[PDB]
Amino acid sequence: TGYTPIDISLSLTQFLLSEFVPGAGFVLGLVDIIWGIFGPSQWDAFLVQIEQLINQRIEEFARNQAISRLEGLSNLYQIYAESFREWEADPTNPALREEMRIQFNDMNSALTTAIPLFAVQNYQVPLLSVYVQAANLHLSVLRDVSVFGQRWGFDAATINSRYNDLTRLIGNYTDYAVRWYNTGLERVWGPDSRDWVRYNQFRRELTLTVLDIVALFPNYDSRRYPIRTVSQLTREIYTNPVLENFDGSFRGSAQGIERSIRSPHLMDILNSITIYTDAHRGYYYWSGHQIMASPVGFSGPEFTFPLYGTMGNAAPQQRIVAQLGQGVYRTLSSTLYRRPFNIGINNQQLSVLDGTEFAYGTSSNLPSAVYRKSGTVDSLDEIPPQNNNVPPRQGFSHRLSHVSMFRSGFSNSSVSIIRAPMFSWIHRSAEFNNIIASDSITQIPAVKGNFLFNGSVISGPGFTGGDLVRLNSSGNNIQNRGYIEVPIHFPSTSTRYRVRVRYASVTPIHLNVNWGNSSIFSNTVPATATSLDNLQSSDFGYFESANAFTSSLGNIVGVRNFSGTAGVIIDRFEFIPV
């Protein structure tokens, strides 16, 4: 196959993003993508994928115990799934209802017992992806009993008790996973470029196999999400062909490489990249470039970033239009390393790109844009498809959101030149527009807004699928009130929507939600957190408009912080069709 846990996880994410609704389909999805396997192979592969990265194998007894238990859970969940399917086909049947009650208890009990074995002391990191798979299944099964347990014949006390388990464990599993993600990532940090490559690889691979799945855990709260709900993952992950295809190591460069990534920002759409070519001893290369981007929904003028790298004129500038079709899904780069025996200003070490093909996502086909030539350092190896049953240009998992640059040296005066374009990839669930569905709960992260006043975009804690918006206090000035505004599009003009906001606050705070020019909520909302600096799962709460409205109110939604002294974090807006 050539498949890894990264491929499998991306496919699970596609499923959880588009089919997050209770019923037989969800249960059978999980068997099809993850739990329907035979034997230890898949599980062993999940462990190897992290073990080989941190260069540490799990102690052999604990390793075999974890694998062995996952096999048991798989067998048991296959039986549960089949019983569920049979029950759904004939729901009033008391034999099938009794079998669901027994199967749920066995599944619930088995998972509660198994999970600590995926959290074994000194091996939490390499066990983290199987931990998260088991957690996911557990929350799934607790959600099942919450939605269907009455129909199965459980009493109200048992149902409410299992529901309280669900909401608590959404929190505990999330905090555990993020904690060990942070700890694992930090242990892999080092001062040189080889360390940075490993560090970013850890970030990338565990974003795909852990954090992306953890960001969907809140969706399991059936009282909060009683119908289908669609999340959007706005976080960016990174490739860097020059650094990642380099067998040596630039000393002390790790910090500089990490800082070449741009800081937290409102989501934008990459429109074009204009690449400048420089040359040395007949070797032509990508010396610098300029990015042009738009706000979400193309809802404001195109803006230009400051020049990346240096503006060479060894050949004419080339404008690559990124935003054709579904955008650029893939880069195929040619790396150029020059390492002469005798180096100097007239005979430089070069670490650069002498070519890149930019390939487009498209439901048919579009010729690639090519800077000079194609190459074989392929983003698809690190940023694989979410659906490998169609061609990659249709089954892609990410879109190119930005290109920045790690750079060192000047062509006129340095012995060593590094120009290492940093490619930034956003998950394709981050839609170009904010489109409100009529038959599901649409989640729109606040970082998908296009106007932020007296506030800033801050790094997410790792479990929200992206970054967050912080609205500052006014300093008791009514004209200086923190505001985030989000452009939205309603394909259905008759559906009525309640607007719910997910937020974090240390003190009770007065917030105003506008839909168009109309205020649909203006009240104090409770404190949810002890600190805005170290967010855990339970620090996020919800408030909502009491009434429901239609798109006649307008094409923007916003939140304003009325407090003169306190700040607030906005995660996302949620539209609930009534």
Helix segments in 19-59, DSSP class H: 24-30, 41-54
C-alpha–C-alpha distance, residues 99 and 101, integer Å: 5
Co-location of 315 and 407 in the same domain? yes
Handedness of CA 292, 294, 298, 300 (dihedral sign): negative
Q: How far apart are the first and last CA of the chain?
A: 45
Chain breaks in the chain following residues, C–N > 2.5 Å: none
Structure tokens at 485: 């505004």
Q: What is the DSSP letter of 308?
A: E
C-alpha–C-alpha distance, residues 92 and 109, integer Å: 25
Co-location of 456 and 391 in the same domain? no
Q: Is 572 helix (H, G, I), strand (E, B) or coil?
A: strand
Q: Are strands 441-445 and 229-230 parallel, antiparallel or unpaired?
A: parallel
DSSP labels for 277-305?
Answer: EEEETTEEEEEEEEEEEEEGGG-S--EEP
Phi, psi of 229 (to 5 degrees): -135, 135
Q: Is 67 helix (H, G, I), strand (E, B) or coil?
A: helix
Co-location of 203 and 229 in the same domain? no
C-alpha–C-alpha distance, residues 233 and 228, integer Å: 17
CATH number at residue 185: 1.20.190.10
| Domain extent for 446 | 224-235+433-578
Q: Among residues 432, 452, 470, which one ends one of the domains? A: 432
Q: What is the DSSP letter of 361?
A: P
Q: What is the DSSP letter of 251?
A: T
Q: Among residues 198, 223, 248, which one ends one of the domains? A: 223
CA 417 distance to own-chain centroid: 34
Co-location of 445 and 400 in the same domain? no
The strand ranges marked E within 431-508 are 441-445, 451-453, 455-458, 468-471, 483-487, 497-504
Co-location of 212 and 242 in the same domain? no
Residue recorded with tokens 């300093």: 475
Co-location of 412 and 443 in the same domain? no
Q: In the chain, how many domains are there? A: 3
Q: Among residues 403, 432, 461, which one ends one of the domains? A: 432
Contact by Cβ (8 Å): 285, 354: yes
Contact by Cβ (8 Å): 130, 180: no
From the CB of residue 72, how many other CB atoms can be counted at a distance below 10 Å?
13
Contact by Cβ (8 Å): 304, 291: yes
Torsion-angle region of residue 476: left (phi > 0), alpha (psi -120 to 50) or beta? left
C-alpha–C-alpha distance, residues 453 and 559, integer Å: 11
Co-location of 190 and 297 in the same domain? no
Contact by Cβ (8 Å): 436, 442: yes
CATH number at residue 259: 2.100.10.10
Letter string b/e over residues 214-228, b meaning 16 or more CB atoms within 10 A of that residue's CB: bbbbbbbbbebbeeb
CATH number at residue 447: 2.60.120.260
Helix segments in 90-124, DSSP class H: 94-114
Burial of 251 (0-12, 13-18, 19+ CB in 10 A): exposed
Half-sphere exposure of 91 (CA within 13 A, CB side): 8
Give the method used: X-ray
Co-location of 440 and 420 in the same domain? no
DSSP labels for 116-132?
Answer: GGGS-TT-TTTTHHHHH
β-bridge partners, 28: none
C-alpha–C-alpha distance, residues 349 and 336, integer Å: 10
Residue recorded with tokens 């109110």: 553
CA dihedral defined by 109, 112, 114, 120, rounded to 10 degrees?
Answer: -160
Co-location of 231 and 241 in the same domain? no
β-bridge partners, 456: 470
Helices 60-89 and 94-114 meet at what angle, rounded to 10?
A: 160
Helix (H) or strand (E) holding 449: none
The strand ranges marked E within 129-267 are 229-230, 236-239
Q: Are strands 349-360 and 416-427 parallel, antiparallel or unpaired?
A: parallel
Phi, psi of 397 (to 5 degrees): -105, -25
C-alpha–C-alpha distance, residues 372 and 413, integer Å: 26
Contact by Cβ (8 Å): 273, 320: yes
Q: Is 349 helix (H, G, I), strand (E, B) or coil?
A: strand
Co-location of 368 and 397 in the same domain? yes
List % helix, strand, coil for the chain (3-state, nearest 5): 35, 30, 35
From the CB of residue 152, how many other CB atoms can be counted at a distance below 10 Å?
21
Co-location of 216 and 300 in the same domain? no
Co-location of 35 and 58 in the same domain? yes
Rounded (5°) CA angle 145-148-150: 95
Residue recorded with tokens 């801050």: 458
Q: Is 202 helix (H, G, I), strand (E, B) or coil?
A: helix
